Structure formats: structure tokens, C-alpha cells
């Protein structure tokens, strides 16, 4: 619900590998969140419709829990996507200082 | 993200009907020329450093005010950002050339880029000029007859020109 | 949707890299396989009416009780919706054939299938029976390789339902 | 992570003994306190950053095992 | 490492699903390029001995100043290192052609390339033009699918170097 | 996680030299049979739920104490867990059969499954029995010549047998 | 937005949501004492800018003869001019860093994006390393005592980042 | 123990690069200046006992109900361990003066101050007064740089108390 | 993670008393030669790539089994790890030199390096010999009296040698 | 983390039968006396801070080596940690009181606290002694019947004694 927004909670969207790893205890919550971000459903349902900047806004609201400070933050974050993939964007967000704090 | 096949499928589904035999024939012709399309895409991919370097040299010969102190490409970070932007746009053009539809290029690259450049103070006309220079330096490479079978790739050349012009018109 | 080309481009775009040789090999495989798939799509498109009517009748045969009063199969409207749904499944199978990927099915049909079937109490077994009938008649209608493609997509739909 | 290097996960046994406890007592606890010893599985790509995080955070690791190979 | 079917299994494993029409079509397109890439690797392996010497000589031709004393090129052990470097590149190109994917060349050469060339003070343009010479000579050794596979893989290595 | 071709390449790298001609012919002979292996893996995938259903029916017909209260697979969640384990075992075995290399299966699926069942109290012999039941069902579905051309695939069936046997022995 | 002593102090105080403690103002006092040799060095180094740049250009050409012949990067009056301009840039940002008592000007204006620009334009880092080594030699004479050490720290930092 | 030089080492270790100029020259400021700080530490060592008692009776003075029976002040061994605790605080002041940082103070005494204060109904105001008294003495005992060395840590201690 | 001054204060806390004036004399002398050790640390940081390059060159010259195929640093990304590890080790040694205590060295990664190199299969004796090689190179680099004022620094050299040898003994 | 009702249901499911009328009778006997248990737990909760203050004062009284430097309980932050430990173990005993089962005690922290205290080095018999004495201090408050209606409280006292001593014996 925090990542996929409760309307994508469908049996087709259900990451079962991540869930089983979590249930084992071999997966951290940070890694479960990251794996949900780095998933086909998150790219196809969230990244593809939106531009890099609106996708950054969504990811800041959902992963950090806070809306972007201004449009310049959208701009500075969108370059990670544009140049290294939204996988590198998600890794930067979830392995950042703010998420860890 | 759409290619030609998914574009046809989506339009047919909006009409709520199967694909007509004309549409299937069009897609068959597309698939038949797909090998030439792959050749052009590989030419663009393998020559990305050459294309970017030539476009940069030409652009900074034409527009010296970029590389002057107080210009928009003056320090090393700004020059590296310039070259990075050119590489990214070339990447999305090659994606759109493989797919056959400019939907990926417009959706993922150009959809809000002019607003970004205005917010950054970047001359959008200079970015468009760099994109046209990459067009020239690329069609130099797409037309390289050597090492491949000879044939009529005029349609692919027109398609690549349209994608580059779409990029330039979107940024500026 | 999700085709070979689209997976290639999206995988490149998610790592932020240029399309390299392996991606172009996959695209080449798609472009070579396009001919049998388009042939299969044309075959299933020509005979859509016979396939849909026979599938509906096979569904009714497997479950006679559904057409009884008070059940889902009674009434002109419900059987018209039956024919409509089988037409949807056939249309999306042909779309997946042309696209050379299960993307049209995974997006249009399979995404949200359980929720919708459980909400309207639609038995998946009806649709599996209809798809099995389509599977059977594809063998007659299609020979060799286009048959194999159509069977791949119909099997994907069946596994999605069951 | 597809390549051979993305393979060969590693298990790490971590204790949060007093070296961690001092720094956390200075900084403070944002979350409830857990047991000292735990087994944490990390892929090779994240192996070095994870150990840098463990050492900077002040924890002492017990034993490192190669789960794969 | 990484191949085409390796990427297929990786994608399917990530999505937690069975191999579908897209993935098996990619595997088919990979197995169709099996034997031409095999013959390309065969041809490059046959001639390697002349290519390595020709490559180091073309390197010295492109950078005459390196050969003079007080530089990297001066020294017999340095000559052996040049030959070994060229042999490494050619060996991994053959491995990649056998594997039908740029994986072995990615993880055996490209990974860690820039920082090594910087730390050992090895100029990359040397290898760029050495691979350019190897490209020129593969232009004449082979023709057909094998030659274009060799061209793609050599060009990928060249773009990696720059 | 490798394919057999990567195994050969890595062995060649370890011994420093190129691939011998014997190795190259072995790899080519494997590859020409790849369009014949694709039908086998497709047969495993397209029939996967049927294989799982029949294997579960036979497995729970053989042993009732599991379903019985106090048994390992008595609670409804644990029955679902059983079903999902059979699913994943079959899926990763099909992965390995496609790859022609059994290392993927050990590296990603079978690495610590035995220890997981040791920790969870599940009898490993029952999992081995389930895997062998899926062996039988998979062979049945593989032999079906309907909708495929006739041919001699003894290598494929024997390889699938070896893969399933290795998985079953690994679990217990 | 540079990373200087005062600004690193302010940033590490802000991140912890606290006032500037003793040690922060303490390091700031260290910096304000530091500044006098730094400004003396920057003055003695900005006064001699033209001779330094000229000598650096000539030293680079001497140490790399091959660049001078036709068909190379160094052939041509325009490439001469851009060599002089690049070394002038490096010197100007070294003086900036001296004045600011930090590597912020160098790390932001020169170092960040250095490798990409060099690679794209096929510029060899060794040219600028030799130019900066010449400048180091000359500022060995131009500066006495503290100022020489302060200038050499930043020239060494630039050389290390070039390598 | 977050001392300034150790903080330098930490704030460089979290990153991947060596100690740059700012770090070295801040260590230089410390290494120049340590002599007045350690001088003030030894001076406060020489006057420990007088500060202990004087602060004890000063806190006795301004808050009278402590002298009154029925409070924490009442009790001979109670007052003895009160003097022991104020001696702990002066020892920590000397520790911080030695360390050229606020690390030793925050390590032991400030860390979890309010919890122990509430658990043992020891509000920070009494210790605030004691440290104001000790600050008044350090105002006359030490002059020059050492005066500032004492005053800054005394103020950090009282701010932590309040 | 404790400085020599912090370490002394830690033992003072352990004894519960003040710091004796003799220890204060030692600490004042340490802060007096802090200028000398800062110059040493600056000479370590500025010449770090040179020290690592010399150490790598002669380490690979002395031991050929690592570069060769199947060696611990053959695949050209394992040398990435080799050079990175050597740089990290010298960073830690510079940290220890500045702090004047090995506690900062022990706390961060001396405990885990041994067991990580056990798990990876990296031989520890090679790493130790590399540590001695960087020790010799750093000794030579710090000996350079040019550009700095002359003075007595044998205590610093002994400290640095002890730190390098201690790190090598820890890994070996 | 189990309740007396939860334990009863667990055994009932294990034997596979319904809940027997004797088990229902004992559950009803427990439930009718619920306000007993709630008043005890609520009084313990309300008076916990005074209990902990008294416990800290005494454990400082009889055990002396801790308070001076060098002991496992000198520093002030270490005092916050010790107070937190005694508070949380009191809270866990309160949980076991309300639930009526020790599984809420044994599973959650007692498993890991053993190796935790073995690794820390703080003596465990001192911990058990502090548990017993804080039990006595809390029991004194639990006697207080004022402001509440009078009644019997022996069974709750027996259960609380069992749980306190169980925690001590686990720790010891
Ligand atoms: C922030 C400071 C800064 C630096 C340092 C900088 C370096 C720099 N030098 C450039 C041109 C150049 N600079 C040189 C330097 C060479 N000339 C030869 O005489 C020498 C051997 C050698 C110098 C030692 C050359 C050859 C070029 C032309 C490269 C090309 O365009 O192909 C360019 C490309 C812009 C153009 O095309 O004019 C940059 C970015 N730019 C900056 O904004
Ligand atoms: C995939 C879609 C996409 C693209 C392409 C994109 C480009 C992009 N260009 C940027 C800045 C920039 N872009 C340029 C390039 C321009 N200025 C030069 O003069 C040239 C004339 C011209 C290039 C031909 C420069 C110099 C900057 C730096 C601005 C700054 O750092 O302040 C930035 C933000 C700054 C950063 O984080 O580094 C982005 C995000 N963003 C996107 O979401
Ligand atoms: C592994 C990735 C991959 C590559 C590298 C590739 C190249 C490629 N190009 C081919 C034919 C061709 N290639 C071209 C393209 C050329 N025409 C002009 O000369 C242009 C310079 C240039 C393109 C802009 C043409 C026109 C054909 C023949 C088309 C046909 O016969 O149908 C063929 C088939 C050989 C044949 O038709 O006889 C291949 C394999 N295909 C791939 O799947
Ligand atoms: C993307 C493709 C797609 C499909 C496949 C689809 C199926 C579908 N069929 C529906 C109605 C229905 N569909 C059937 C089908 C039954 N009729 C006969 O009896 C057979 C036994 C059986 C068919 C094999 C029936 C009985 C209903 C009416 C159910 C109701 O109104 O509650 C509905 C409810 C919405 C409505 O029409 O009001 C859906 C969503 N919808 C889609 O958008
Ligand atoms: C399997 C992956 C792999 C690659 C790619 C590889 C290249 C390579 N060659 C090296 C040595 C070297 N290689 C050369 C050759 C270059 N310099 C000139 O002579 C020529 C122009 C040019 C050859 C075209 C030289 C001179 C050295 C010595 C390093 C030095 O002098 O600084 C080194 C440093 C370690 C050593 O071998 O001693 C590497 C990493 N080694 C590998 O294990
Ligand atoms: C990497 C791929 C992967 C695999 C292979 C996998 C298997 C797996 N099955 C599990 C549970 C389980 N699995 C079973 C299966 C047994 N029941 C019996 O009927 C059968 C003989 C046997 C099935 C073959 C049972 C009973 C449990 C629950 C055990 C318990 O709760 O105590 C668990 C524990 C974590 C969880 O389910 O949340 C794993 C990891 N999980 C994965 O992510
Ligand atoms: C899109 C996915 C895809 C599939 C599924 C595929 C299979 C495939 N199987 C083929 C023939 C064959 N298929 C099989 C396999 C079957 N023979 C026996 O009945 C066994 C029961 C069974 C093996 C388990 C065999 C033995 C052949 C003949 C081998 C040959 O072509 O020489 C052929 C070549 C002739 C044709 O069908 O047009 C293909 C392309 N190719 C693909 O691109
Ligand atoms: C070095 C680490 C450390 C600190 C920081 C520390 C503070 C501290 N002071 C305490 C008691 C005390 N604190 C004071 C001081 C205050 N009370 C009166 O109101 C005075 C007016 C006022 C003095 C200005 C007194 C008198 C006690 C004795 C209470 C008692 O145990 O009966 C206690 C209760 C336990 C004990 O020490 O016996 C602690 C923990 N203890 C430590 O071991
Ligand atoms: C911020 C970094 C830093 C710099 C820039 C620096 C330069 C420097 N060196 C100095 C003296 C000195 N410099 C050294 C350095 C040693 N002498 C030998 O030649 C060795 C090769 C060499 C290093 C091991 C020594 C031993 C002294 C005299 C120490 C003393 O008398 O207290 C002084 C104090 C004298 C004055 O005020 O003019 C400074 C400021 N020192 C530093 O810590
Ligand atoms: C915080 C700092 C830290 C370090 C540095 C550390 C050591 C370390 N060395 C590693 C690999 C490696 N390290 C080396 C280097 C050694 N092997 C020999 O050949 C060299 C002479 C020698 C250089 C000192 C090599 C070759 C590897 C590759 C081994 C492999 O691929 O598994 C890795 C795996 C992570 C990765 O490579 O991405 C770690 C964590 N652990 C830490 O927590
Ligand atoms: C899961 C619930 C939980 C438990 C079980 C728990 C016990 C516990 N006590 C700890 C250390 C400690 N344990 C004690 C208590 C002992 N020392 C003396 O006072 C007594 C003899 C004795 C108590 C009666 C102390 C004082 C420390 C602090 C050690 C230190 O900071 O170095 C630690 C190490 C990490 C930390 O303190 O944050 C834990 C986990 N804490 C919890 O959050
Ligand atoms: C806000 C939460 C809450 C509380 C605090 C609470 C206490 C509470 N206990 C009651 C009954 C009672 N409660 C007790 C228990 C007391 N007898 C003594 O031994 C002890 C002080 C204590 C047990 C440790 C007794 C004896 C009764 C009379 C009913 C009976 O047990 O037969 C009543 C009903 C008053 C009446 O009889 O008219 C209340 C309000 N009820 C609640 O819903």
C-alpha cells in the first residue's frame, strides 16, 4: 500500500519471491522496499506513465514519506534516472542518508 | 512505452476490433525490414562516442559563448553535463529507432525537458543546435555502406531524421 | 505493453545503457518469428465467428447446469456476454501473436482477473473450457509453426486462468 | 547482479557489542532495541558497502561465511 | 556470467514466473546464431598468432613515440605484456562469440577497466586502435553472419575503452 | 548462475587457453539441439499447474498424517506453503533444463532449502517424494508427441531425469 | 555552495540540529588564522600569473614533444591559445582555493567532470600534470615559508585529482 | 568518544577518500593550541577540592530547602556522595580540557542525563548553580587562552544540564 | 575509534581518578610534535596513488601467480578490488597515524578483513607482503626532506612502521 | 506470545478434538477472576516508577563494586541502560501476569538475553538477584488494597512469584 498505492494490490502484481525471502528472515525491510521499487510492475505502472520529474515526486512521497521541497529537487533527482536508470535512482533513494536516518 | 506493433494493437482495441489484414501486412513489412532497422540501431549504438564528440566540437566551434567564463558550459561539471545530455538524447533516439515509434523518446526523454532547461537557465536553442549536429554526425554513420549488405535504407534514414527533428523541436 | 522489443528497450533504459548485441539478437529472433505469428493471427482472425460460437457451445456442453434458470448461463444477455468474453480472449490472443509477447494478455486480460472473476462470480473453468476448444480447433486451422505460436499463447491464457 | 560476481552471496554474523552501544547511546535510539547477534545475508555487489556500514556504525562482526561456493 | 539464455532466466526468475513466448523466442534466436558465432570463434582462434603480432605492431605504428626509451613501450617485458593484453582481448572476444553474449567480455575486461588503466598508467587509446586494427583484419578474414558478430563484439569492446 | 556453455568458457579461462576444437564441437552439437530443448521446457511450463495438481493428489493420497491435524501440511497456510514449494522446485528445474547447466538450480533455489526445512520441522523425505512425483508427471507430459514433430530426444529426457534426481537428493 | 571550513562547520551543526559548539568555532578560528598566509600566497601567485602560464605552456611542450608535430592536438595556433587558457583556468582556481582556504573551488570548478571532458575531447591528463608540476617548481621560488606550503597543498590536490 | 580529531577520521572514513587539507589544518589548529587547554586541565586539577566544597555550599546556599531536613541535601553520607558527584563533574571537565573536545563530557555524564535525573528526582538546576560557581572561580583562576578553554567547556556542560 | 588522548582519558576513567601530570606531559609533547605527524600524514595522503602504484607494481612483479589466469587478481576486476583494498588499507593506516593509536585501526575493519579474505579465498600472505611493500614506499616518500623544514622524525617513522606491521600481522 | 486461551486452543488443535468441557470450565474460572488480574497489572503499571527507583537504590546499596569506576555499572549512560533493563523486565513480568502464560516472556527476549549478557560480561547472578529484589519491591505495592474494593489475591501472587523466578532462572 505504501509503494503500490492499494489499487495495484492484485494477485498479478504480487511479488512472491520477495515475500518468501522476507518470511524466511533473509531479507531486510529496506531490501523488500527496494525490491518492490525495482520491479516490473513498478516500472510499467508508475514509471512509464509519468515523466522523470513526476516519477521522482511519487517516489519521494512513497519511499521517503515526504513531498519534494521544490521543483529543483525533482530536477536534481531526475538526472539519476535519466543517466543511470530508475534502478540506480531507487538504490540512491533507499541507500541514501535520509532514508537510513 | 509503445512500439509499432503495440501502437497498432492499442488502436485496434480502441476500435474494439481485430486487426485488419492491411495492418497485419504493414506489420509484416516492418518485420521484414527489421534487419535493416537493427543495422541502423547498431550503427547508432556503436558510434555514440564519435557522434557526441563531433557534435560537441562543431557546437563549441559555432557557439563559443558557451565555453566562456559565465557561459552555460564553462566549468568541467557543466561541460560534462552537456555531453551527458547529448548521450542521453542519442540513447533515446536509438530506442525510438529500434521500436519504430517515437513514444518512448517523447514520453521518457522530451516530455518535460524544455521546462527543465528553462529552470536551469540553459539556452534551449543551443540544445536544439547540438541535437541537429548529432543528427548530421549520425546520418554520416547510418549511411556507412562498409561492412554491411547493400540495400535501400532510405526509410530508416527518414525515420532517424524525424526522430532527431522531433527532439530538436521539442527542446526548442 | 510487453513485447520482445519493449522488454529489450526497458531493460536497456532501466540500467541506463545503449542497446547492445544481446538485445539486438533477441530483437532479430522476434523479427524472424514475426512471419509465423502474423500467419497464425490472420488465420484466427479469419475464422473468429466459428471459433467463438464453438467455444461458447463447448462451455455450455461442459457445464449444462449453468444454462438452467437462476444460474449464470440463462438468458440472452448472459450468453451474449459469454460470446463477447470469448471474443475478447481470442482478440487478445491474436494481439499477443502479432506483438510476439504476452503483453496484451497480461495487461488487458490477466491483470485483475481474479478480482473481477470473484466479484462477478465468473467460474474460470468456463473460460478454460472455451480456450481448450480454441486450442483444439487451432490445430485444424493452423499447421506446423503458426500452430505452435498460437498454442503457446492459448496455453499462457489457460495457465493464467487456472 | 546477473554476472558471476552478482552471485556468491555471503552471510555475516554481527554482534552490536559495546562499541556500537556507546555510539548509539550518544546518538540515541529511534527504534526498539534488538538482540546483538544476527545473521545478515548480503550479495557480493552490496558486500563491501554493507561491511563499511557495519564497521562505521561500530558493530563487531562474528563470522563471515560464503553461502555460495 | 551472462549470455542470452542467462538473461532470459534472470528475467523469468525476477518476475517469479515460467519461461514465456518472449523468452523462448529469444532463446530460439540465440540458438539460431549458435553455429555462425561458433564458426566466427573458430576462425579468430585459428589466426590469433598473426593477429596479436600485427596488433602490437599497428599499436607502435599509431604511437611511434611510445617505442622510444623512457616510455611504456620500451622494454621486452613490456612487449610481452602488450602481446598478452592483445591475447586476452581476442580470447574473451572468442568466448563472447561462443556464448552469443557480451557477458564474458563485460566481466573479464570491462569491469574495472578504467581504474586499472589509470592506476597502471596504461593509455586506453593504445587498445582502442589495436582493436581497430583487429577490426580491419576481421573485415577480410570472415564474411556473413560470423563476420558481423565479430564486428559487433569488437566494436562493443572499443566503445567500452573510450 | 551459468549455462553449460559458460561452464566450458570458464574452464577454458581457468586453464588459460582457448576452447579446444573438441569443446567447440560439443557446444555446437548441444546448440543445434537447442530448438529441440525449447519444446521440452515449453512442455514443462505449459503443463505446470497440471503437474503440480497431480503430484499433490498422489502425494496426499500416499501420506495422510501430513493432512491430519498435527501434521506438517495440516493448517491451510502450510498446505499453501507445500504447493508453493512444489511450484518453485518445478520452475527452477525447468530453468536448469533450459540452461543445460545445473548450477543455476543449486545457486538460486536449492542452496539452503534443506536447512530451511530442517529449521521448519518439515520432513525432507516427503519433499523428495514430492519431487519424484513431479518427476513422473513431468516425464509423462514431456513424452507427449501431440502438437510437436516426432523425434528422438533421449538426451533431453535423461537430462531432465538427472536434474530432478539431483534436486530430490539435494533436498533430503 | 562550496565545501569550506566555515561552511562544513555550519553544515555539520545544521545536520545535528544544534548550535555551533566550541569545536566548530574553534576550527573556524583555525581557519581565520590560516587565511593570512593563504591570501599572501594568492597575491604572490596572481601577480605572477602570466609568466607562470607562459612557462607552464612551454614546459608542457618541452616534456611532450610529439604533441607539437602536424596532425596532433598541439598543432595549431588555436590549440596553443586553448592550452594557455586551460592553464590560466587552473591557476585562477588554485588562487580561489587559497583564498577560500579549502578545495571547494577546485573540486567544483575543475575536478568535477574532469575525466569526462578529458575523455570526450581526448585531452591527456599528463599535459596538465606537467604544467602543474612546473607551476609547483616556480611557486617554490615565488613563495616563502607558510605561503609556499599552502600553495603546494592545493597544487598537489589538483595534481592528484588529475592523475 | 566524539573528539575533533577522531571526528575528522570518522567523517573521512564514511567517505572513500583520504584526509584533505581542511582536516589536516584543523588538526593543526588543535595541535598548536593544545598547550593552553592542558594547562587549564592541570590548573583545575590543582584546585579540585576547593571547587568541590565551594560548589557544594553554594548550591546549599541559593536553594535553602536542600539545607532543610527532608530533602536530598539532608544526610551526612548523602552530602559526601554529593561532593563525590561534583568531583566527578570537575574530573570530566578536566577530561574534556585534555581531549580538546566535548567528547569525554558527552560520553559519560550528559548521555542519558534527563532519564537519571527524573528517576532520582535530581533536577538539573542544582548542578547548574554548582557549575556557575565553578565558572566564577575559573574566571579568576585562569587567564588568557586557558580562561577561554575552561569557560567554553563549562558553558557546554551547563547547556547540556539545562 | 579512540585517539591516544582519548585512550589515556579512558584509562583515567578506568582508574576513576584524574590524569597524572606525567601523562599530561606526555600528551603535551604529543600535541607539540602534532605538527610533525600532520606533515607525515599529508605526505601520506598526497602521495597515496604513487605509493599504491609502486606497491602494486613490485607486488605483481614479485608474485606472478596472481596476474595469470586463475590467479587471485586475473579477471581485471579483481585487480580493481586489489588496488581498492590497498588504498583502503593505506587510508586506515593514515587514520591510525593521525590518531596516534591503533584503536581506530582495530575498531574499523581489522577484525572483519581476516574472515572476509578467508571467505573470498584471497590469500592473506599476499596482502601482508603488499602491506610491507606500501610500508617501504611510504617510508621512502615521507623521508623526503625537500619542500619541508628539517627535523627529527624517527619517532614518527617507528610509529608508522609499527602500524603497517601491525596491520599486516592482523591480516596474517 | 501466547494466552492461556491461546494455549488451550493450541493443545485442542494438536489433539485434533474440540475443546473439552473441563478446559472450558478452567477458562471460565480464569475469566470470572479477570478483574483480579487487571487490578494487579494496572497497579503494577501505575506504581512501576517508584518500584524501579527503590530497586535502583537498593541494588546500589547491597552491591557496591558497580558504583565505583571500573565496574559493569559505573557510567551515567550505563545507568540509563541498567534502568531501562530493569524497567523492561518488570514490564515483561507484567505482560506474563496479564496473559497468564510465560511464553510471552520466554520467547521474546530471554532467548537472546542469555548470549547478550554472556557477550557483555556483566554478571548474570547479579541480574537474577535484582529481579528477585525488584519482585519484592513491586509485591509490596501489589499488597496495597487502599482505594480499591477488598478481596483475595493469593493466586495472582503465586503466579507473579513463579514468573519472576522463571525470568531469574532463565537469566541465571
Ligand atoms: C574550468 C576550467 C576548464 C578547463 C581546464 C577546461 C579544459 C578544456 N579545453 C578545451 C579545448 C582544448 N584544450 C587543449 C589543450 C592542449 N592544447 C595544447 O597546446 C596542449 C598540449 C594542451 C594543453 C597543455 C586542446 C588541444 C583543446 C582542443 C580539443 C578539441 O576540441 O578537440 C575544452 C573544450 C572546449 C573547446 O572546444 O574549446 C575544455 C573543456 N575547460 C574549462 O572550462
Ligand atoms: C531523459 C530526459 C532528461 C534529460 C536529457 C535531462 C537533462 C538534464 N540536464 C541537466 C543540467 C545541464 N544540461 C546542460 C547541457 C546544456 N547546456 C549546455 O550549454 C549545452 C548547450 C546544452 C547541452 C547540448 C548543462 C550544461 C547542464 C548543467 C546546469 C547546471 O549544472 O547548473 C539536468 C539537471 C542537473 C544535474 O542534476 O546534473 C538534467 C536533469 N533530464 C531529464 O529528465
Ligand atoms: C546481432 C545483431 C544483428 C546485426 C549486426 C545484423 C546485421 C544484418 N544485416 C543483414 C542484411 C541487411 N542489412 C542491411 C542494412 C544496410 N543497408 C545499407 O547498406 C545500410 C548502410 C545499412 C543499414 C543502414 C540491408 C539493406 C540488408 C539486406 C536486407 C534484405 O536482404 O532483406 C543481415 C542478414 C544477411 C542477409 O540478408 O543476407 C544481418 C544479420 N542483424 C542482426 O540481428
Ligand atoms: C479484458 C477482457 C474482459 C473480459 C474477458 C471480461 C469478462 C466480464 N464478463 C462480465 C459479465 C458476464 N460474463 C458472463 C459469462 C458467462 N456467460 C455464460 O454463461 C458462460 C458460462 C460464461 C462465459 C464462458 C456472465 C454470466 C456475466 C454476467 C455476470 C453478472 O452480471 O454478474 C463482466 C462484468 C462487467 C459487465 O459486463 O457488466 C466482465 C468484466 N471483461 C473484460 O473487460
Ligand atoms: C584478462 C584481463 C586483463 C587485461 C585486459 C590486462 C591488461 C594489463 N596489462 C598490464 C601491464 C602492461 N601492459 C602494457 C602494454 C601497453 N602499454 C604499451 O606497451 C602498449 C602500447 C600497450 C599494449 C597495446 C604495459 C606497458 C604494461 C606495464 C604497466 C606499466 O608499464 O605501467 C596490466 C597491469 C598488471 C600486469 O599485467 O602486470 C593489465 C591489467 N590484464 C589482464 O589480466
Ligand atoms: C528461492 C525460492 C524459494 C523456495 C524454494 C522456497 C521454499 C520455502 N517454503 C517455506 C515454508 C514451508 N514449506 C513447506 C512444504 C512442505 N510441506 C509438505 O507438505 C511438503 C513435503 C513440503 C513441500 C514440498 C511447509 C510445511 C512450510 C511451512 C513450515 C512451518 O511453518 O513450520 C519457506 C519458509 C518461508 C515462508 O514460506 O514464508 C521457504 C523459504 N521459498 C523460496 O523463496
Ligand atoms: C516460440 C518458441 C519455439 C518453440 C517451442 C520451438 C520448437 C521447434 N521444434 C521444432 C522441431 C522439433 N521439435 C522436437 C521436440 C519434440 N519432438 C518429440 O515429439 C518430443 C516429445 C519433443 C521433445 C521433448 C523435435 C525432436 C523436433 C525435430 C528436430 C529437428 O528439427 O531436426 C522446430 C523446427 C520445425 C518447426 O516446428 O517449424 C521448432 C522451431 N521453436 C521456437 O522458436
Ligand atoms: C560519573 C557518572 C555518574 C553520574 C553523572 C551520576 C549522577 C548521580 N547522582 C546520584 C545521587 C545524588 N546526587 C546528588 C546531588 C544533588 N542532589 C541534591 O539535591 C544536591 C543539592 C544536589 C547537588 C548540587 C545527591 C545528594 C545524591 C544522593 C542521593 C542518594 O543516593 O541518596 C545518582 C544515584 C545513584 C548513585 O550515584 O548512588 C546518580 C546516578 N552518577 C554517576 O556514577
Ligand atoms: C597543516 C599541515 C602542516 C604544514 C603545512 C606544516 C608546515 C610547518 N612545518 C613546521 C616545522 C616542522 N616541520 C617538520 C616536518 C618534518 N621535518 C622533516 O624534514 C620531515 C621530512 C618532515 C615530516 C616527517 C618538523 C620536524 C618541524 C619542526 C617541529 C618543531 O620544532 O616543533 C611548522 C611550524 C614552524 C613555523 O611556525 O613556521 C609548520 C607550520 N606543518 C604541518 O603539520
Ligand atoms: C571497509 C574496507 C573493507 C575491505 C577493503 C574489505 C576487503 C574485501 N575484498 C574483497 C574482494 C577482493 N579483494 C581483493 C584484493 C586482495 N586479493 C589479492 O589479490 C590482492 C594482493 C589483495 C589486495 C590487498 C581481491 C583480488 C578481491 C576479489 C575476490 C573475489 O572476486 O571474490 C571484498 C568483496 C567486495 C567486492 O569486491 O566488491 C571485500 C569486502 N573488506 C572491508 O570491510
Ligand atoms: C529485547 C529487549 C531488551 C533486552 C533483553 C535488553 C537487555 C540489554 N542490555 C544491554 C547492555 C546493558 N545491560 C545492563 C544491565 C546490567 N548491568 C548492571 O547494571 C546489572 C547487573 C545488570 C542489570 C540488572 C547495562 C548497565 C548495560 C549497558 C552496557 C553498555 O552500555 O556498555 C544490551 C546491549 C545493547 C543496549 O543496551 O542497547 C541489551 C540488548 N535490552 C532490550 O531493549
Ligand atoms: C479502569 C480499568 C478498571 C479497573 C481499575 C477496575 C477495578 C474494579 N474492580 C471491580 C470489582 C472487584 N475488583 C476486585 C480486586 C481488588 N480487590 C483487592 O484484592 C485488590 C486491591 C484488587 C485485586 C488485586 C474485587 C475483590 C472486586 C469485587 C468483585 C469480586 O471479586 O467478587 C470493580 C467494580 C466495583 C464494584 O464492585 O461496585 C471495579 C471498577 N475495573 C476496570 O474496568
Residue numbers in the entry:
A (entry chain 4): 52 to 152
B (entry chain k), F (entry chain i), I (entry chain h), J (entry chain g): 1 to 172
C (entry chain d), E (entry chain c), H (entry chain a): 2 to 163
D (entry chain m): 10 to 78
G (entry chain b): 1 to 163
Paper lines:
The top and bottom AP cylinders also use different linkers to connect to PC hexamers. For the bottom pentacylindrical portion of the core, two common CpcG linkers tether the Rb and Rb’ PC hexamers to the A/A’ cylinders, whereas, at the top, an unusual combination of CpcJ and CpcN is used. Two CpcJ linkers connect four side PC hexamers (Rs1/Rs2 and Rs1’/Rs2’) to the D/D’ cylinders via the inter-domain linker. Although previous studies proposed CpcJ as a linker in Gv742128–30, our study is the first to demonstrate its function structurally. In contrast, the final resolution of PC hexamers ranged from 2.74 Å to 4.10 Å.
